[model samples]
Target: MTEYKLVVVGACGVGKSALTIQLIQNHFVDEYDPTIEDSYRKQVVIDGETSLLDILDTAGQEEYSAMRDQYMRTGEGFLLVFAINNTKSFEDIHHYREQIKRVKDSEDVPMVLVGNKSDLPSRTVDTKQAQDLARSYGIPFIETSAKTRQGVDDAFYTLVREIRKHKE
Candidate 1:
């Protein structure tokens, strides 16, 4: 069985769990309890090969520091997530992206710039802007909403694909 280590990160209340749970548990969640830490595993078939996705959902409330750094070191791929409705959340993507690059000490790492919460009525972040930024970083940008399950599978599986390419 092949396994992949993936991490989900974003500002607090930005649907990190929503994305992770929708993928791992196959359903969206509401009133989810706050957590200091959580990780999920899923057995999925991609391109006819079974992949055990090891996903870590980390808090963005700065209950952090060394805790995050530890996972950042071990996580093979990362999902840099943000909320389309929250401008603050969208821009904060820079810090997380910067930290990953700094911690890994590599400019190129397997990742995706995820704009979560697409179903929200108020969208402050434009898709084109998001796409431009992601392209600048040399990664892919995908908008997703865990509520509607839009792009949920693509978001996670794409990173697995990214990790696959990184191996080469």
Candidate 2:
């Protein structure tokens, strides 16, 4: 079986954990609690091929920045997430992508730009902006809502496809 290592990164309270948990367990969280770091493993089949996904859901707190390099190095694919309702969080996506590229020592790292909390009405980062940013980075872009379970699976599936394509 093939193994894919993936990491979820974003600013705190941006639904990184929510989306991750929802994808793996079909559950959603309603509160904001900071995560130091956590790991989850899931067996997923894409295009009739089964693979093991070892996911690292990294902390989004500023103090945890030092460990991002380590997380970046270990990941075969990444979900660079941000909250649509939080503008500052949206602004940090590029920073996360750059850090991953720097740590991975490659410009063409496999990643998917994720905008979470799509169910919220107070979105500050519009879809156009996110799409433009993703286009600039040459990566797939998706918006998801863990609460409603919208596009959550697509985000992970897209990242896996990107990882496989990069490996080829």
Candidate 3:
């Protein structure tokens, strides 16, 4: 089985790390350092094929911006995370996608648009809006709740599938 390098990036407090832990450990946490990068490895079977996932959990681009190109340079797939309640967070998705494209020097990067905080009630970015955005990008969009672990597995699973098809 081949290993997949994944990166999770988005606006701060959008639950980038939260989703990472949910996938890696199936647990939830409240905080993470905005300057440090968190990494994890997990073995899983997706579509009956065993694969190792190497994940890089990143700080929001708004705060720590130095290592932007580094992870983007090496990552195989990306999760462009954003908080559903924050419209501004949705805006940053464009920038992150552009940034990764610039670093990879290609437009068709394996990436997923993640709308987090699905467990919250007050919302600014509506579902259809995000679906249309992802459709325009020709990528998968998954709404995940790190708190309840909703859509957590599907987000990563779909990304892995994207990476697989991106090569073949």
Candidate 4:
């Protein structure tokens, strides 16, 4: 089993930490921290393979722009998250992806764009929009609701498979 470093990045309250917890612990954290600082870590195991998930749950990238930008550097894969009801989160992902490309200098690094909060019916951003965004960026995207586990496991499992294939 090989271990890879995974990075989870997104705007504040976008569910980066929740997804990390979901992937690692299969639990959800409803409590939110608007001003949560960066530097959170979790380990995930899949099919007997363990990987270190280095999560930078930054309250906002504006606080540590350079460091946030550097998170994409030298990572195996990335889970770019966004809130389904927050359009700004979607836009943040666009900016995030661009900066990731620039900082890592590798377009080959696979990314999975997650439209979180599937349980919310009032989702501002629908699956089509998420799909369009992924299509525009030429990457994989999925709708997930950590609260209900809807598409949650599928998102991570699918991405792990995709990343492995892409890297191979």
Candidate 5:
């Protein structure tokens, strides 16, 4: 089985860990304390094809920025996340990219920017903005929510597809 290391990066409340749980265990967080730089791993299977994903869910806090960079440098790809309802979280996208790019030894580790918490109606981060950002970076993008399960599978599967596309 092939292995893929994917890192999840976003601001503290943008639901990085929540997305991790949703993608791996298909579980959603109803009410829980915010993440404190915790990381986890999960294996994904597509049509009976198994691929181990070493997922590192980095903390969104600025204090852990160094550790976040360290984890991201080791990633083969990333799920760069932001909350749809939170504007501040969305602002971290460029910073994450820049920091990761500075540390990554290779030039081909693509990132999939994700707008999480799409179930919320009062979204400050527009889908068009996200698309524009992705287009500028030449990477894939998705809007998702663990609450309503909107775009969850799409986000995960799309990234997998993107990564596989680069295989050959």
Candidate 6:
């Protein structure tokens, strides 16, 4: 089985850890707590083959910025996530994308643009706008709700497919 290294990134309190946990364990936490860095591994069927998915749940705090280069270096694919209710998180997508490109030294790195917290009542970012941005980057755009488990699997599955199809 092949091993795929995936990383989730976004601003603090934007549900990056929540989304990662929900995808890997099907569990969600309601409280907001800062994450340092965490990793999980699981075997899954992707593209009709068994694959070991190694997920890196990254800390979103500013203090973690220095470690991003190392994270990007090990990643096979990325989920650039943001909370739909927070426009600033959405705006940070460009920064994350640029950093990933710089670290990987490739502009075509496999990635998915995710808008999390879809279950929340208020949204400051438009779905169409997010789609447009993802399209510009040649990546898929998906919205997810960790609490409701909506689109959570799809987000991860899509990234896996992208990674599998990526020509290194």
Error of 4 at 161 (Å): 1.9
Candidate 5 C-alpha lDDT tens digits along 1-168: 888877777777777777778877777876656655555666778656777777777755566467666677677787888898888878878877877778885546668889988777698988999999999888988888877778876777677766776775
lDDT by residue for model 6 (88-153), tens = 999988988888888899988999999998988889999999999998999999999999999998
Candidate 1's C-alpha runs over 4 A off are none
Q: Per-model C-alpha lDDT, please?
A: 0.89, 0.87, 0.90, 0.74, 0.77, 0.87
Where model 2 places Cα greater than 4 Å from the true spot, the runs are 63-66
- TM-score of every prediction relative to native: 0.95, 0.94, 0.94, 0.82, 0.86, 0.93
Cα lDDT tens digits, model 2, 66-147, are: 5677778788999999999899998888787778778889989999999998988888898999999999999999989989
List clashing residue pairs in candidate 4.
none
Cα TM-score of candidate 2: 0.94
Tell how far residue 38 is off in model 6, in angstroms: 0.6
lDDT of 4 by residue, 1-168 (tens): 444556677777888778766766778888966666555565656566665555455455465476666566656677889998898988889877777788888777778889988888698887898899888877788888888778876677666755677767
The order by descending TM-score is 1, 3, 2, 6, 5, 4
Worst 10 residues of 2 by lDDT: 59-68
For model 6, give the 10-residue run with minimal summed lDDT: 59-68
**In model 4, which regions exceed 4 Å deviation?**
32-60
What TM-score quantifies how close candidate 6 is to the native fold?
0.93
Alpha-carbon RMSD, each predicted model: 1.3, 1.5, 1.6, 2.7, 2.2, 1.6
Give the C-alpha lDDT of model 5: 0.77
